[PDB]
Design a binder for these strands. Sequence first.
DNA 1: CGGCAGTGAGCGCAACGCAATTC
DNA 2: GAATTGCGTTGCGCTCACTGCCG
Lengths: 62, 62
Amino acid sequence: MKPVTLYDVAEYAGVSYQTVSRVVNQASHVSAKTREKVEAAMAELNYIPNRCAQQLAGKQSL
Amino acid sequence: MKPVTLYDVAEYAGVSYQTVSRVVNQASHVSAKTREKVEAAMAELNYIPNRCAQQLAGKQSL
DNA sequence: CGGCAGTGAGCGCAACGCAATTC
DNA sequence: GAATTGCGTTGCGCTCACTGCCG
């Protein structure tokens, strides 16, 4: 009925959303405490980068 | 890559971006004389009406 | 006044930047 | 002392749909 959404992982992790997807995107100065939770959320809901809102968001390819 | 979307094909045909997409969704009364014209222009300019954008667009599923 | 096109807005993830604050 | 948090949006194509543009 309903697939996965980044917003779900954000709320499950209890973080500012940005910190979640940045771990699989380009995490740099993220505290171990912060990544600890977001990893749990990403693995819990199974976060798969879908090809839809990626091209549209303004990627290097439409 | 060239960001030629329904916005660029509009001016090229002398219309808006709705006449262009008109044939992509249903292809109803497209001016009656510009139905095949836009379709041809699409193939000519190698215009690609996305792949997943039209899905998240006009969802109306909520 | 009537046909038929055009604009408007929303959906989703992704990214920028410098200093104060917390660990 | 050095890590680390953030903010908050747009915005893009693309859709529908009603309403206005041009006649």
